[PDB]
Paper text:
The thienopyrimidine derivative compound 3 is a very potent human [name] inhibitor identified by means of a fragment-based approach to generate novel chemical scaffolds. Based on our assays, this is also a potent inhibitor of TbHsp83. The molecule is composed of a central di-halogenated phenyl ring, linked to a thienopyrimidine moiety at its position 1 and an alkyl group at position 5. The thienopyrimidine moiety occupies pocket 1, in a similar arrangement as the purine moiety of compound 1. But its carboxamide modification establishes additional hydrogen bonds with the enzyme; a direct one with residues Gly82 and two water-mediated with residues Lys44 and Asn91. But unlike compound 1 and the benzamide derivative compound 4, it shares several contacts with ATP, like Asn91 a hydrogen-bonding partner of the ribose moiety. The halogenated aromatic ring is positioned against the protein at the entrance of pocket 2, with only a chlorine atom occupying it. The position of Asn91 was different when compared to the other two complexes, in this case the side chain makes a direct contact with the small molecule in a conformation expected in the complex of [name] with phosphonucleotides. A major structural characteristic of this complex is the modification of helices 3 and 4, each shortened by a couple of residues. The unwinding of helix 3 and 4 pushes the position of the latter closer to helix 1, shifting its position by over 1 Å.
Among the chaperones, heat shock protein 90 ([name]) – alternately referred to as [name] or Hsp86 because of the variable molecular weight amongst different orthologues – is a hallmark of the stress response at the cellular level, and a major component of the eukaryotic proteome. Its main function is to serve as a molecular chaperone helping nascent polypeptides avoid mis-folding and limiting protein aggregation during thermal stress. Although the compounds represent diverse chemical scaffolds with unique properties, they all inhibit the enzymatic ATPase function of the chaperone by binding the ATP pocket in the N-terminal domain (NTD), which together with the middle and C-terminal domains define the highly conserved [name] protein architecture. [name] [name] (TbHsp83), the subject of interest herein, is 59% identical in sequence to human [name]α.
Author numbering: 1 to 208
The structure:
C-alpha cells in the first residue's frame, strides 16, 4: 500500500548503531529476546480471550514459530499473539522505547552488559546483533496488517501490506549478517530453543 517513512529519535539511533557495530561475542541472546517478546504477546491475547473468546477468531492456537530460510539467508520468529496496529508499531519501536533505550545505554556506560537489554524493555533491538535488516509484519484485531522495516540508517518505514497467512500476531524477519549464518542451522537453533522452552508457556515450533 502506501509507504510512510519515519525517523528514529537520537537515543534509538545511538542504540541501533551501538548494537549493529558491537564486538559483543555472545550474539545468540537475540533469540531469547525475540521469543520472550512473542511469549508476552501471546499472554496479551490470551488475557483478552478469557473475557471474550471471540478475540481469538480464526486463530485459536497461541504458539511461537522459528523459521530458518537458507535460500534467502533469513531467520524468522513469528507468533500468533495480540499483534500491533500501525500506531502500535511506531509507539513500540519508536516512542515508548526511548526511556528504556536511554537507561540501557547508561547501564552499559556504568559497567552493565548487553545481555541485560531485556531488563530495559528494548530487547527487540538485539536483533541487530545478527541482522543488517529487520522486518516486522504485524496484525492486530483492530487494524489492517502493517509492515515495519529498518536497516538502522536513522529511519524506518511503515507500510500497509495485506497478508492472509498472518491472521493475528507478529512475524519478525531477520536478514542475517554475512558472518552470522550459524543461526540458519537446524542444530544451533534446536539447542537454543531447548534452553528456554520449558520456561515459555507456549509451543515453540522449529520449522526445518
Ligand atoms: C497490543 C499492542 N501490541 C504490542 O505492544 C506488541 C508488541 C510486540 C512485540 C514487540 C515488543 C517491543 O517492546 C516490548 C516492550 N515495550 C512495552 C513497554 C516497550 C516498547 C518491541 Cl520494542 C518490539 C516488538 Cl516487535 N513483539 C512481538 N512479537 N509481539 C508484540 S505485540
Amino acid at each position: 500500500g502506501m509507504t510512510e517513512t519515519f525517523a528514529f529519535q537520537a537515543e534509538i539511533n545511538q542504540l541501533m548503531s551501538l548494537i549493529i557495530n558491537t564486538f559483543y561475542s555472545n550474539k545468540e541472546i537475540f533469540l531469547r529476546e525475540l521469543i520472550s517478546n512473542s511469549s508476552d504477546a501471546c499472554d496479551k491475547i490470551r488475557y483478552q480471550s478469557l473475557t471474550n473468546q471471540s478475540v481469538l477468531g480464526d486463530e485459536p492456537h497461541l504458539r511461537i514459530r522459528v523459521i530458518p530460510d537458507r535460500v534467502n539467508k533469513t531467520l524468522t520468529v513469528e507468533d500468533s499473539g495480540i499483534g500491533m496496529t500501525k500506531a502500535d508499531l511506531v509507539n513500540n519501536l519508536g516512542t515508548i522505547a526511548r526511556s528504556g533505550t536511554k537507561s540501557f545505554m547508561e547501564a552499559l556506560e556504568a559497567g552493565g552488559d548487553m545481555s541485560m537489554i531485556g531488563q530495559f524493555g528494548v530487547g527487540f533491538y538485539s536483533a541487530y546483533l545478527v541482522a543488517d535488516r529487520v522486518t516486522v509484519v504485524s496484525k492486530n484485531n483492530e487494524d489492517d496488517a502493517y509492515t515495519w522495516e529498518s536497516s538502522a540508517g536513522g529511519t524506518f518505514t511503515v507500510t500497509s501490506t495485506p497478508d492472509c497467512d498472518l491472521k493475528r500476531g507478529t512475524r519478525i524477519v531477520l536478514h542475517l549478517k554475512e558472518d552470522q549464518q550459524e543461526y540458519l542451522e537446524e542444530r544451533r537453533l534446536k539447542d537454543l530453543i531447548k534452553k528456554h522452552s520449558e520456561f515459555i508457556g507456549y509451543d515453540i515450533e522449529l520449522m526445518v
